[PDB]
Design a protein around this nucleic acid. Structure first.
Ligand SMILES: [Mg+2]
Length: 140
RNA sequence: AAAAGCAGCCACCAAUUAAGAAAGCGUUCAAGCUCAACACCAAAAAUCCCAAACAUAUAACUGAACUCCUCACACCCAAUUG
């Protein structure tokens, strides 16, 4: 019916997360990989991009890609790749306010990513809480 | 190389208008099914089980050599004794 993937854009086509996991349901991996590579080339690579693949009963696909994620997104915005081993103890990310405003503004895009709130405060609160759960803390 | 929500540890925020970084079930692994919440909502052993038997007429009856009623009283213990 519907599957949710998070394979990295730059990553061409692995095996487990796109081979047997999908073969059990019968698919055409060629077209899926081609569309994924096209969407990856359409924008700078090196960032995960979710997707809402719509598996039709006629063995046809209609991929629906979106904006980057939140984990790696904030990890790259703060400047640290690997996260903390124990949070919130092992602090790491220390983001200011202007960067948070900018990242929230550029994230406020795809409606499929839960954008049922008119103001942006409610939306940015979610990513702020997610960062708090991570080894990142909001400065100022 | 993997556990993403349950091989192991951390904090467990918070957007859905209004509620789990997940309380179970099932997944190598994700897939699927529920829940927390919201909208009216005790019996068994060998000859054969063993007293008939009734729930609905007024709390009181029956029941000794125990006590009493007429008379006179020494006349219900092993061994032993007087
Ligand atoms: Mg007498």
């Amino acid at each position: 019916g519907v599957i949710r993937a998070i394979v990295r854009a730059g990553l061409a086509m692995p095996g487990p997360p796109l081979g047997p996991v999908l073969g059990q349901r019968g698919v055409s991996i060629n077209q899926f990989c081609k569309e994924f590579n096209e969407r990856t080339k359409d924008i700078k690579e090196g960032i995960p991009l979710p997707t809402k693949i719509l598996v039709k009963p006629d063995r046809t696909f209609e991929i629906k890609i979106g904006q980057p994620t939140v984990s790696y997104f904030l990890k790259a915005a703060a400047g640290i790749e690997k996260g903390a081993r124990q949070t919130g103890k092992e602090v790491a990310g220390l983001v200011t306010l202007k960067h948070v405003y900018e990242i929230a503004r550029i994230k406020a895009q795809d409606e499929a990513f839960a954008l049922q709130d008119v103001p942006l405060s409610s939306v940015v609160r979610s990513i702020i809480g997610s960062a708090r759960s991570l080894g990142i803390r909001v400065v100022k």
